[PDB]
């Protein structure tokens, strides 16, 4: 549960601006190699249209639960995850993601 949960932060274009180090012992990536890159680079092809839809829901509602999707692991295979996303607006500034790893690797 907890040791399977990490935070990431995203710009409104879905790029990583920050990621917890915890993503290393779970998916392989180092956070630094993640920034500047679209989350989109990483979804499995079959989840892509669904994530697009959640992103639309996230921008229109302001908070969403993604439902289940797969992320290309660092050293091959795909890890299942579920994410809670929350738009932080100020007076849209960024997207906070709470990411829970459902499964192990492939």
């Amino acid at each position: 549960l907890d040791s399977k949960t990490f935070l990431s932060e995203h710009s409104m274009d879905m790029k990583f601006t920050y990621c917890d180090d915890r993503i290393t012992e779970l998916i392989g990536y180092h956070p630094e190699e993640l920034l500047g890159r679209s989350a989109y680079e990483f979804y499995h092809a079959l989840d892509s249209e669904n994530m697009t839809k959640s992103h639309q829901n996230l921008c229109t509602k302001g908070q969403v639960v993604s439902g289940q999707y797969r992320m290309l692991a660092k050293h091959g295979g795909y890890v299942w995850l579920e994410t809670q996303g929350t738009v932080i607006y100020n007076p849209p500034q960024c997207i906070m993601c709470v990411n829970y790893v459902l499964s192990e690797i492939e």
């Binding site: 274009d13 679209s38 680079e41 092809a45 290309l72």
Partner: protein, 110 residues
């Protein structure tokens, strides 16, 4: 038979900045589904790096043609083989940052 092919322009990062509407019949997305997203996001995980290094190289090649083959995810979520031929353009009356002109064709890998 004429290959399906479409024109696009990108910034040096790879973001679509212009899309020729011939893309509908080539990859099934509308232009505005492409605009503002990086071309790497429609690319196969095994080919993303090569595409990134292609865009990096295209700028060092003195405006000559760079070609690359990669799998592109159609609006159907099918992997299509694309040959993208690209080159820089930089208007020599100015010193504005060069951008990248792409021709994108559905080809056979065989």
């Amino acid at each position: 038979c004429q290959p399906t092919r479409f024109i696009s322009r990108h910034n040096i990062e790879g973001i679509f900045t212009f899309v020729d509407h011939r893309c509908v019949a080539t990859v099934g997305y509308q232009p505005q589904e492409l605009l503002g997203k990086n071309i790497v996001e429609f690319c196969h995980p095994e080919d993303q790096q090569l595409l990134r290094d292609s865009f990096q190289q295209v700028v060092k090649l003195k405006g000559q043609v760079l070609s690359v083959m990669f799998r592109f995810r159609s609006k159907n979520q099918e992997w299509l083989w694309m040959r993208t031929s690209s080159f820089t353009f930089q208007n020599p009356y100015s010193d504005e940052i060069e951008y990248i002109i792409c021709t994108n064709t559905n080809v056979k890998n065989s």
